[PDB]
């Protein structure tokens with residue numbers, strides 16, 4: 001019979017955030033954001049009840065080279081702890097081999113965040129100098145993009161980042177933002193364009209996205225391989241796209257209440 | 263195994279007839295982004311294939327009366343082709359009847375005008391009557407307008423469906439020619455990918471205006487449940503991650519730009 005769907009997700013703004021009065025709230029009511037709204041829409045169109053659960057290790061999902069064990073949200077799906085992931089989870093080949101993904105609900109590419117006034121306009125620019133350090137989220141699809149790239153500029157960037165001291169990798173997007181804001185232009189952060197565009201709209205309005213994106217991809221709703229939820233969830237994503245709901249939700253969480261002007 | 267029958271469509275710069283194609287044979291008759299993409303997918307999946315241009319020259323729509331699918335979608339649904347490798351938009355009604363890979367290219371509906379036309383947006387088009395406008399007479403753009411509940415787009419559809427003479431065209435080439443020859447009195451609604459290609463082609467007399475009206479993707483399609491779906495999708499993800507899709511886009515779009 002019908003069972004409550006366990007949703008794995010991650011505290012990443014503005015996708016899932018603690019509500020102001022979270023300390024006296026319980027269950028799903030503790031959270032707000034794009035993916036909270038998206039989970040409600042998907043659940044409504046698919047006819048299920050659900051419980052939002054923040055991934056224990058705070059990771060997206062990577063496979064350890066030695067143990068072959070998956071961590072993060074991907075791990076929660078692979079090992080049967082969650083029924084679905086509704087999060088800014090990038091569709092990647094290695095993940096697609098072990099979990100199912102809907103068609104993407106949001107587009108993005110790796111991008112560059114600078115402190116305003118930093119003399120950098122492109123990845124090439126970063127790669128041709130050493131005064132400004134740069135890095136990525138310490139686990140996830142961005143780091144993997146650099147590790148795997150055969151493109152010379154990106155390989156050069158990876159060769160620098162992997163050996164940089166102190167480490168240029170950060171544990172959370174928030175840590176990356178802090179490092180940009182505090183480093184007087186001497187750190188630049190490589191992060192997904194969606195997060196970058198969100199942060200550019202937040203006080204104190206001291207960061208900006210520069211240059212084109214380094215790649216082009218999408219976030220997808222993920223389920224364990226072969227789950228019966230996969231098909232209706234995908235149809236729901238396509239419906240929400242075609243109805244304009246995904247556009248409305250992006251505007252709601254990114255731009256409608258932006259803090260850095262119009 | 264056997265030779266995979268690929269349905270596709272003549273649409274620049276995805277599939278085009280080569281110069282001197284009349285003395286060429288088979289796959290060698292054709293060139294373009296989807297020709298290259300088909301070669302890459304087939305190499306990764308280890309199959310031989312035959313490119314075939316869809317008989318009716320359509321993308322795929324379901325007749326409201328007979329419920330029969332035409333175009334490339336129809337070729338898959340009725341067992342005439344094994345796979346479609348083309349700028350085929352992923353849509354809900356199609357996803358219900360065929361399988362799609364993850365998308366290989368992003369696009370949105372967009373506006374093409376003859377340069378100097380006093381139009382900057384869909385809202386602009388919707389608020390006037392001097393300039394006619396239309397879409398490809400079958401496909402996802404037409405369906406977008408037919409189904410939209412957004413006020414500006416519904417207003418546009420209400421005009422287009424009843425316009426006389428017809429504002430709909432059989433091919434993109436026909437829509438572009440109509441823009442070019444109508445002295446600013448016809449604007450064309452078409453996918454941003456095609457728009458951006460045409461904008462950089464002689465005679466350089468058209469431009470894209472405004473933002474895109476939606477955001478979606480093209481996918482590789484197979485008959486529902488086909489065993490080809492899984493390896494083809496993995497191939498699309500590999501080509502994406504390797505930077506090959508970007509290389510192919512750069513090759514077929516901005517490399518052949520003729521307008522500076």
Ligand SMILES: CC(C)S(=O)(=O)NC[C@H](C)c1ccc(-c2ccc([C@@H](C)CNS(=O)(=O)C(C)C)cc2)cc1
Pocket residue numbers: 091092103104105106107108216217218219237238241246352353364365366367368369477478479480498499502507
């Ligand atoms: C891993 C890659 C193969 S990928 O990310 O899946 N695709 C790569 C390719 C360059 C690309 C990248 C991004 C997009 C893209 C386009 C639209 C969207 C959303 C708004 C809608 N997705 S959809 O499938 O078209 C829709 C009908 C629901 C999300 C992603 C489309 C194509």
Ligand SMILES: N[C@@H](Cn1cc(F)c(=O)[nH]c1=O)C(=O)O
Pocket residue numbers: 060061088089090091137139140141142143173190191192195
């Ligand atoms: N979406 C990524 C995780 N992720 C998140 C970010 F904000 C970022 O900048 N880079 C990144 O890899 C994934 O799914 O691994």
Ligand SMILES: N[C@@H](Cn1cc(F)c(=O)[nH]c1=O)C(=O)O
Pocket residue numbers: 321322349350351352398400401402403404434451452453456
């Ligand atoms: N990709 C569409 C077909 N298609 C092509 C175009 F060039 C266009 O402008 N509009 C459109 O619907 C589909 O798959 O129906």
